[PDB]
């Protein structure tokens, strides 16, 4: 399948070269997979989600996304126009308030929630969790991410936006999950992207168009935007049967575009997520 005039990041993930604008992907499109977006919520009524999104959990007075961040990330995972995996099922877990903040204890509870809640959902092709969040190093936060991964969920986490080594941030620094840095449309490391040995992969993160609250759209930047590209890619590849939740991060690294990014510090992987789809 070909989506013309796609957002640059979608075109990038199906291309061996920057500078194109059509996204190419297998029409299975993540059908039968599920992606949990653990964030500020999801505006599930947005036409871009086509009934495939729903809120399953909140720790606050509403499950609605009063911020936009979670809706944007969910759109990059699975919206019809802005998403990588256009037929996946999206489940929202609101661990962040409408200012985008959340206590680590709440975030940990949300991760353990997903590890159990997947047993209440139909995801025959597999389960992914996208975590566009983080703060300073916490062994308890890392352990929660490790448990979620161990339970059979492909966990993708943001590297962070400090232009610093991600070893000092959580859940970015957890070795067993997939830690995602950000790149721009010219294949440069995004100016804010964290780096370091704990990164597994880069995805598009600068000037990413996606869904927003109020039935709208906007372009924003962050490792928060790169992470759902990788989460959606994992769901898409799992639906194709090419990999599993336990092996998807490694498979994405195996099949990535290699050595194509600029300003990658010595010791950080130079790997850009790529779907290897041959139309």
Curated annotation (Swiss-Prot):
One example GO MF annotation: metal ion binding
Residue span, Peptidase S8 domain: 7-279
Binding sites annotated in the UniProt record for Ca(2+) 1: 175, 177, 200
Disulfide bonds: 34-123, 178-249
GO CC annotations on file: extracellular region
Keyword set, alphabetical order: Calcium, Disulfide bond, Hydrolase, Metal-binding, Protease, Serine protease, Signal, Zymogen
Identification of the protein by name: Proteinase K
Active-site residue list: 39 (charge relay system), 69 (charge relay system), 224 (charge relay system)
Native organism: Parengyodontium album
Record text on cofactor binding: Binds 2 calcium ions per subunit.
EC nos: 3.4.21.64
Catalytic activity, as annotated: Hydrolysis of keratin, and of other proteins with subtilisin-like specificity. Hydrolyzes peptide amides
Gene: PROK
Cofactor: Ca(2+)
């Amino acid at each position: 399948a070909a989506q013309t005039n796609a957002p640059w990041g979608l075109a990038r993930i199906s291309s061996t070269s920057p500078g194109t604008s059509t996204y190419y992907y297998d029409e299975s499109a993540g059908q039968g997979s599920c992606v949990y977006v653990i964030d500020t919520g999801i505006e599930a009524s947005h036409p871009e989600f086509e009934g495939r999104a729903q809120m399953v959990k909140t720790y606050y007075y509403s499950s609605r996304d009063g911020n936009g961040h979670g809706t944007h990330c969910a759109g990059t995972v699975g919206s019809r126009t802005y998403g990588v995996a256009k037929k996946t099922q999206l489940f929202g877990v609101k661990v962040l308030d409408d200012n985008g903040s959340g206590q680590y204890s709440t975030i940990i509870a949300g991760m353990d929630f997903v590890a159990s809640d997947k047993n209440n959902r139909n995801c025959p092709k597999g389960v992914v969790a996208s975590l566009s969040l983080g703060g300073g190093y916490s062994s308890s936060v890392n352990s929660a991410a490790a448990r979620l991964q161990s339970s059979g969920v492909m966990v993708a986490v943001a590297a962070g936006n400090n232009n610093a080594d991600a070893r000092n941030y959580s859940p970015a620094s957890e070795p067993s999950v997939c830690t995602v840095g950000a790149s721009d449309r010219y294949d440069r490391r995004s100016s804010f992207s964290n780096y370091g040995s704990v990164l597994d992969i880069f995805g598009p993160g600068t000037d990413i168009l996606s869904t927003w609250i109020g039935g709208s759209t906007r372009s924003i930047s962050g490792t928060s935007m790169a992470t759902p590209h990788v989460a959606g890619l994992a769901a898409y590849l799992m639906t194709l049967g090419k990999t599993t939740a336990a092996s998807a991060c490694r498979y994405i690294a195996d099949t990535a575009n290699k050595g194509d990014l600029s300003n990658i510090p010595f010791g950080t992987v130079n790997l850009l997520a790529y779907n290897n789809y041959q139309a």
